[PDB]
Nucleic acid binder design. Sequence first.
RNA 1: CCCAUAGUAGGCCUAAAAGCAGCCACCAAUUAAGAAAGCGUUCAAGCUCAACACCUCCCAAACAUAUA
Lengths: 28, 140, 157, 80, 205, 23, 118, 146
Amino acid sequence: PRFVSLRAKQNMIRRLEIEAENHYWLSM
Amino acid sequence: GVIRAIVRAGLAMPGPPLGPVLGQRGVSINQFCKEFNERTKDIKEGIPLPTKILVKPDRTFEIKIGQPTVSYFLKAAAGIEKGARQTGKEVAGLVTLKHVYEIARIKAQDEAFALQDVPLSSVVRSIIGSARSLGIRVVK
Amino acid sequence: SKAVTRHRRVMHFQRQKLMAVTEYIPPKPAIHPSCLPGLIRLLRREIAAVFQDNRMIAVCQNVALSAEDKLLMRHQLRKHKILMKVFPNQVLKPFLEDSKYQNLLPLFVGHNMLLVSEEPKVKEMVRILRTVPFLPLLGGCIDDTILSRQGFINYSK
Amino acid sequence: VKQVRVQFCPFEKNVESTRTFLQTVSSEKVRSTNLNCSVIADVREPCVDVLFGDGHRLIMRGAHLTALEMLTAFASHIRA
Amino acid sequence: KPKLRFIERAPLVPKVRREPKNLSDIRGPSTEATEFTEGNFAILALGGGYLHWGHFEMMRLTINRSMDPKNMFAIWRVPAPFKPITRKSVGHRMGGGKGAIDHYVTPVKAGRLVVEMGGRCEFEEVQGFLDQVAHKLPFAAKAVSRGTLEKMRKDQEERERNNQNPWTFERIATANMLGIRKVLSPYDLTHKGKYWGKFYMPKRV
Amino acid sequence: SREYWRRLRKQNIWRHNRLSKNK
Amino acid sequence: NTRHIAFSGNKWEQKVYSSHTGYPGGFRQVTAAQLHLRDPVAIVKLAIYGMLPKNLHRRTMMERLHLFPDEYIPEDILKNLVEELPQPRKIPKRLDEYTQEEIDAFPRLWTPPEDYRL
Amino acid sequence: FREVVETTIIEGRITATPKESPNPPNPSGQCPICRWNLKHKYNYDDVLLLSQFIRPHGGMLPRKITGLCQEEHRKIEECVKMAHRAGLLPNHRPRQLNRYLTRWAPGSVKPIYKKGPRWNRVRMPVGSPLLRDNVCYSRTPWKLYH
RNA sequence: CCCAUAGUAGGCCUAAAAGCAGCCACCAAUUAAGAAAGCGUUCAAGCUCAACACCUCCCAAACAUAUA
Ligand SMILES: [Zn+2]
């Protein structure tokens, strides 16, 4: 059993934000 | 204490409707059937008559009585000795309005039975209400 | 282990991180919302008809009796054309201000029963109440004039 | 307990404390259990007299009092 | 006939060919028999599992016990046990073919209605023995009305429209955001992360 | 009238009776 | 003043100090309250001893730490002290210790009913 | 407030009624907490706020008299429990280990003889989770379990 | 928190089974208490509910307050 800290969520989230902007610049 | 029964005036001291049901407070059923035979004599005989009886803690009898019942009153007045079974759709006795009004004049009279309504519709509504719950059709 | 198991299968750790990041977030308002701002007319018509009916009225605290004792009181006042009325004061407090009873607004609260009348047997009612060492006479009002219990002695006498 | 002289002025401004006391426990309900006590209620800041047969005299001016303090204090003097 | 009819152990016609335990008949949202049809009350499955014969007798027995047939009728929605679950002989070594057919079973997925109720009855009347029944089931179940069913579906719409979280499972899985289909099922693109195995997450948007 | 609301009360009492079966 | 420590929460009644005399059946678990009645140094002493780096310098470091349970410190140690360190917890004052102007500056929040007993 | 003076005579005397300060900064709030901008800005430390809701023998006052929020009544009720145990209310007696932030009653808690593995460790409750939503001026929130 | 009378010991079956062994109707009185939802009795009598009037030996030490 392993649990998810705040580091892991914030890291995951900033990768998701880079990903969303990659989605934006590939749209035109 | 308070005791209320439906002991018929046809038989004074039967037994199981008076023996063990009275044999807790401590009774003398000879006086009860004696005074109950006074109540048998004072009114029309061969009928169910409810009691009021209040057994005092000083161990004395106070039998108070009023009119006859509503069961053998309506069913005997309709001439029914053993009533209907379903009493929802089955009928045996068809009793008119005016008969119910004629018995309702001698009805709203008692204190222990407490049918003390000042108007007439307040009582005939009640006993027509009992006439719907039994096997008697309210004619007219 | 199969994909369907009997116990809740342990997720991969990035599966579990996805599940934690994509949890439900409820909206939070800036201010909590909780910290922001037929029978009735039967009683109105019935008891309002009782207002115009009676010339004299009285009232008591008729809660202090038994059932057959209230039957005795009901019959002994049935001997008169006086009437006794158990009804909520909840509606009777707007009843009084409707009937222009300003001296009767401080009268009707708690357990009370009306003794509305046109003919005073209230002295003989007191004669019934003197044998029971309780249940006092609360003040009435004959024809927009208030009756204290001393006034019940005077008028009833 | 032998006697309670319960007294209030409803021609004046009412107090529902001693009147509620008059309803719930100065009735026949407790006297159905407690036969020796003798209530009497007059009617004209209120006042409750309590006659202990033994050796006391318990008088309560229950204008500002409440029914629970008057009742539990009353029964505190019943237990004595 | 306002009672639960008898559900047999196995149909009259047998099933001679053995079957693979395709456990995807438990996984995911149910398609068949999710809505009411001349019903008012039901036992909705908040999760998938297998019904045996003994479960069917628990429902027929403990419902027809406490039921007014003049007030309430009831319908099976889940059919008779038709899936042949096999077991090998007890304490025998592996291989040597597939074991003989032991007992039949129905698969019930999540969101399935099991037993419809109907008649002149309020919900609060029928909550009791359908909660007892709903607890004797193998999967997590719940007694659900019509108004309670549309109530919690409208709740799920409220959750899906209210959340201040920019990241849902649907946006991440279908776009393959964090390269995350390496960890997900292909079913997780249609279950949308509310189903794990046979379980169901109602709390998860 | 009087018997209207008395009827409504009796149906409410029946309702509470039919709800209080399992308790 | 290490008799006058203050655990947060129910740590006086929940936190357990377990030791073992090496003999069989010699396992001794004792809560923080009982151990604080035995010796009013051992809670701060065990806390520090757990904080220090787990090596051989640890016990020379423990022989530099001087614990006293009261206001009384020996004179030979009082003549060595240089700096007094500030206490890490701000001791909240009680209702007796608020001055009158501190009480008067705080508003009465709510009107009590004129007739309520207390 | 009113008192019950007795000696046998029993009378009730309304004595020295207080009143709230004339200008709530948030009028048309609901609770006296809500009216004074104190929805998350009090703790067990500050006893000037707690003492106004306490019976003089230490107990709480009911929610109808104080007119509190339900939420803030449970919060003050909890903070008053947590402040009697830290000895911050010494004059609310009817007539020694120092504590603070004690959630449970001290004479009711079994000691943790087997603290679990690292993935199932039995922790010690510190403070109350009714006071989660207070203003934390730190970045880390309140650790409610030690 | 209270608060419980009356047609009635509802008819039929049942030794009697009365709201409570079963079928059927389930009307009605006052302002209002169901021909009855749970105890309870062979049966009763008694108790509550709805509704009326107030409303092998634990196992890092530890720590809730300073700006990410
Ligand atoms: Zn508020």
